[PDB]
Amino acid sequence: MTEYKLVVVGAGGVGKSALTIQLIQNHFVDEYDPTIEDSYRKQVVIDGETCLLDILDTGGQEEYSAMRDQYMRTGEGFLCVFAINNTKSFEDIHQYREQIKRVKDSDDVPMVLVGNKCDLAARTVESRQAQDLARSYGIPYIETSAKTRQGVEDAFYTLVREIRQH
Ligand SMILES: Nc1nc2c(ncn2[C@@H]2O[C@H](COP(=O)(O)OP(=O)(O)O)[C@@H](O)[C@H]2O)c(=O)[nH]1
């Protein structure tokens, strides 16, 4: 069976844990210990192929847990997440991508830019701004809501399809 190693990165509070929990357990949590950093597994069929997702939900920043470094170096694809109502988290994306390019020593790394919390009103980051950023990196942009489930499967499965074109 094919395994796909995915890593979820982004500023604190954007919904990295919520997105992962939604994919894994199909439920939305209003509060998830921001310190909890762990890996989750899920068996799913994507385009007729049964595979196992090995997902690392990264926690704190400016820190390198023995596990994060491992997934960061062995990770096959990255979900770079920001929130639609958090301009700083969007501006922060540049830092996460520069970091990933450094670890892989490459500018061709499977990656998907995710704009989360699309269920919230009065967004401060327009879809167009994110689309422009994703285009500049040569990767897809997908909006999601860990609360309503909108785009969640699409974000993770598209990341798998990016790894496949690699
Ligand atoms: N309305 C809304 N709240 C969300 C969404 N995703 C996450 N949250 C909330 O945002 C806060 C931070 O989410 P969390 O998953 O802990 O963020 P992380 O720090 O990136 O892991 C929590 O209070 C969540 O309930 C979403 O899509 N919509």
Ligand SMILES: [Mg+2]
């Ligand atoms: Mg978290």
